[PDB]
Amino acid sequence: GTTISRVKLLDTMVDTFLQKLVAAGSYQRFTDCYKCFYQLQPAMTQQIYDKFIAQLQTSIREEISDIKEEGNLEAVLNALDKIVEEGKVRKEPAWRPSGIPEKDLHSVMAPYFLQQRDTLRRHVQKQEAENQQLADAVLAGRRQVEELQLQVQAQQQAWQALHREQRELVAVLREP
Amino acid sequence: DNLLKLIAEVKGKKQELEVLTANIQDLKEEYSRKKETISTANKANAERLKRLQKSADLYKDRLGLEIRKIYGEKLQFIFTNIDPKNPESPFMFSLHLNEARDYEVSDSAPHLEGLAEFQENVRKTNNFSAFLANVRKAFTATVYN
Amino acid sequence: QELDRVFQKLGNLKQQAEQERDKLQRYQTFLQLLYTLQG
Amino acid sequence: RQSWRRASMKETNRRKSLHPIHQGITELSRSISVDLAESKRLGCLLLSSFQFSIQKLEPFLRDTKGFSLESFRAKASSLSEELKHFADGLETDGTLQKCFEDSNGKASDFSLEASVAEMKEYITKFSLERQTWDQLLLHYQQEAKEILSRGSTEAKITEVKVEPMTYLGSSQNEVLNTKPDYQKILQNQSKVFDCMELVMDELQGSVKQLQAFMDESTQCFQKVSVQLGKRSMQQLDPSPARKLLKLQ
Amino acid sequence: GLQEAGEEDTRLKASLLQLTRELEELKEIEADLERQEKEVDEDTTVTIPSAVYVAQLYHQVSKIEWDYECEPGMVKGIHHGPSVAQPIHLDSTQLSRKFISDYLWSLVDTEW
Amino acid sequence: DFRVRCTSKRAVTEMLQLCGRFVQKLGDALPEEIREPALRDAQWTFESAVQENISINGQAWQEASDNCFMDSDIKVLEDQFDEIIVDIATKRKQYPRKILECVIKTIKAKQEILKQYHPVVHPLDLKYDPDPAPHMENLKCRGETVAKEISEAMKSLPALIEQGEGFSQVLRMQPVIHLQRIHQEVFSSKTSDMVLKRKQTKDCPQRKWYPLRPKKI
Amino acid sequence: MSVDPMTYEAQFFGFTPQTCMLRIYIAFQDYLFEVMQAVEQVILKKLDGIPDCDISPVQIRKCTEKFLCFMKGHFDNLFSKMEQLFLQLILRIPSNILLPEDKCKETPYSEEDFQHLQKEIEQLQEKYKTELCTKQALLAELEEQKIVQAKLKQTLTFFDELHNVGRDHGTSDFRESLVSLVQNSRKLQNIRDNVEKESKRLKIS
Amino acid sequence: RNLLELEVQKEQTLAQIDFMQKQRNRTEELLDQLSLSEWDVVEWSDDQAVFTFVYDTIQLTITFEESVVGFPFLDKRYRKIVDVNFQSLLDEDQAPPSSLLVHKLIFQYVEEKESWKKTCTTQHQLPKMLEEFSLVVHHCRLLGEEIEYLKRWGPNYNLMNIDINNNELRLLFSSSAAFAKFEITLFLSAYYPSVPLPSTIQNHVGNTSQDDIATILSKVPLENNYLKNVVKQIYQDLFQDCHFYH
Description:
Organism (chain C): Homo sapiens (Human)
Structural class of chain F: mainly alpha
Helix content of chain C: over 70%
Shape of chain C: rod-shaped
Radius of gyration of chain C: 17 Å
Structural class of chain C: mainly alpha
Strand order of the largest sheet of chain F: 1-2-3
Strand content of chain F: under 5%
Region (Interaction with NSL1, DSN1 and required for assembly into the outer kinetochore) (chain H): 1-215
Distance between the termini of chain C: 57 Å
Helix content of chain F: 55-70%
Number of helices of chain F: 5
Organism (chain H): Homo sapiens
Largest interface: D-F, 106 and 101 residues
Strand content of chain C: under 5%
Oligomer: heterooctamer
Radius of gyration of chain F: 78 Å
Protein name (chain H): Outer kinetochore KNL1 complex subunit KNL1
Subcellular location (chain H): Nucleus; Chromosome, Centromere, Kinetochore; Cytoplasm
């Protein structure tokens, strides 16, 4: 069968309730219970029974229409029908409140924390990438400083190599 | 008798002539030895003079200066090998010892006024080498005039 | 004549002796002053 | 704004029973003062109901042929007095007071108390749940406002020096740790200048020694040369010029 | 033997005349020897003072001592002109007299 | 409310039933034609007039049933349960949104404060307390001096070596020249004052370091 | 029987379904009472219209009470049946259906994972500051290295200019100059020794 | 007979002449053996005596009391000194610093012996005072010779420079082999080398400390060539084996 709307189900079952109620209130039972007055004028008893039935049925219809009016029942039921028809794919029971707000809110607030973690990871990765180049520059500078110090030491040793010749000359020009 | 006296006289005359001519030959021998000694003295002195002249000629040739003695007790110095156009140009000056036992220059070639400027200094210092070096320098300067 | 010549020679030798005697005290006192100064 | 609750409709008046034909029956209890004991109030109300019934029946059957109305009133008064005595006796024996005692119908109750216990458990659980919800809301809002206020007080120029332990977890920890000294190099530069100056002094001394050396050598050469010259000169006369000039 | 003694007397007086001629020849030889002796003295006296003193004056002026036993055309010797004596080693076969004299005089000290 | 406050329904019903025959006793004097109907109508009237002024457990007689249910407590408990259901449902629907908004605000504030974190690391100050510029200039001047001196020394020393060699050569030909015959011939040869003056007075080499005064004229 | 809280249905509709069911009950019973009372008033006024009404109000009220009890029982049964119909069909939310507001609750998230995520976020926050401080220290090190290199270059050009100055005054190489000077000094010492020996020999002889 | 007697007298006179000439030669030889003292006596007189110390740069003039008239026969050892004079003949304008230092020190000693005006009154104590002075003179001259030697051969011992201020003496040692350069200041006195020298060190370059210098100084004996020995020991201890690195 097709998916029947909730408001139409409500209307049909209310009408069925009215029908079985008026069936329960039969005219023969009505006159049996009111046999005292019925012995005087059965006809006016018949029209007053008909008036009772019509008035009660009209009152029930007015009540259901009214309650649908202020309760906003039709729109809510239609929205619920849309929700159930869009989500009919799921067969397993749907999630329900756990009773503890923390685990209920964990699902809500997880994705944004995940996004923040991802952004922070990107930032720290970029900083590490920059720091790698910085460390490479530090190493190059250290190597250059070492080389310059070695060159200075070479100049110092080249200038200090004159000592052997100077001492040889002193040996040549010896004291008496 | 008389003949005996005559023969005795001739015998006396004999040995007197013999003795006198013998001493003549003795003096001849002495004269020969004297002339030999004189000749060998001449030869020795001549050889010594030749050696001295060789030395003096070497000095004069190498230095160019010529030192000679002339009358009036003057010592003449001749400088050559100075003027490049002719090295034989004689640049002469005469030095002589005066009465006061002092050297003094007599003249020059040509008439140069730098006569005394060296003679007082050579009188005092008695340095002939520097004296003549200065004289040669003065002559060289005179040449280029 | 010989006696006179010998007398003249003796006089000259005596004068030389006097000169040398005068010149002796020079070095004698010289040396003994060096002795006194050195000790 | 408007959404119906069950409490919102309890205040609304309902009618669970038919209105009686008779009027003023409710005022019978109003006419009875509450100063009397509740048993006496019951007796007075029952007597008032009896008189009301008598006075209602008095004119209802007047149309019937023959109606002993005077004897009806006489018997009504006599039976009202007797009924007042009867109510007093029922008050004395205590059975009239039994209307103020409740029975024990537990046979129909036990399920109802079970349901009430379930409701009590549910409402307690839900009260704890809403309390926890309110606590979470206040915690989060207070955290947010505290962070915002602290940030507002922040954003000034608060320079913070970095302690070495901050670099302990750094990726380039080895590079930072292996940093060479740099002032020692600057001191070694001055040391190098000092040693160059010392070498310079040595060079000057060597040059001075060499200078004195060849100076001494030249002096020795000149002395030996003049000695040789004098040795050569010693043979000659003091002045060849005088001897040469004096020749005649 | 009057005549014999007379003829012998003539012979020996003749012998006297020849030996007297020999004596006068000896006397002229004596004059000859005296003149050579005076010539020797005059020569030697002139030569030695003159030559020796001229050479010594040359050397004093030049302060140069020659090597006489060297090969010809080869200036060799010692110059005392400079403060330190230096050996003169020239070659006249390749150098002019002008240059040689100028160089030798250059080495002489001109200071008074 | 002046109505009688009762608690028992069964007791009121049974005591009214017991009081019933007191009203029923009136029927003896009623005529036979109207004995039962009028009497039963009066009995019903009495029951109605005595029942409408009875309140059971704080409720009306017809509203409170025969059972002993605590009607007021049941009603208030049910109302409380429904109200707490509605309240907790509204809380579940509403609170997560505000929670998420506060979380977003806190996250953004934390991101901003992390961005604004500025660490400062001043490099260590390297000291130049000895400035070697005058030292370098002095070293350059001295090095120039000694370079000049060494150049002069290397230029002068060979000259002195040559002069010494020439002088030694002079010394070695001096005797052989002196042996030459030509050379040999050419170069053939008051107050009493004890003075107390000794001999051996000469210009000693130490006079170089001890110049005497020239009488200070 | 256990009473269903129906918290999820109440969260959807905004009200407990039992509330609206009982309000419908009270409205229906009130309307039934009103119409039946109106019919009773009509029948009593009709009885009052006819003369000598033998139908007493008590009798008609008893009949109406009986007929009211008739409807009351039948209405109670049928109304209970239709309330169960509502609670099973209309007001019931299928267990496989989730509200749009709960769309974020479709995927579960364990508390342990959330705690791990919080710890990871805190650790990353620490690491960011650590890397920033490291970068600052590295910049300081680069500046210090630049300063040191400048000083080293100054010293090296000082040596270069010193060597150029030495070269400009003849001696472009000190070592070879010293070696040549030593050799020449030895030669001159030999010459001086020879000269002294010859001079001494001339002095003695 | 008279001629023979005169000839005998002449022979005796000639023998006496030869004897006194031989005595003269012996006396002159004894002088030449003993002419090797520190002081030189240029002039003596009956009133004044003159001594010249080292290389005639110092004059010692002794002035005696006038000889008593009529008594020249008294002992020469009893002559009274009236004025003792010291003078310096050094040309300070061209004198090297060593010469000036020597003269300064010896005149410092003279002023220390200012009492010599009253101590030396007779000729007995003159030779003793002469020895006392001459010893110090010899020591000071030896010190000056050491100074000149070190000014000549200083760089052989790494002693680059010597500066002569007042009695302080600054020895500048420098050597790049040990990276040590310092100036040692020595307080010289007229009592050199017997009196230890109060040295001080200024460390221009290197870590050379006072203790090493003091130990080296105490090691060197207090005798002649003290300064030269100190220089040699310093070079040996600090630079002898250090310079061996080639």
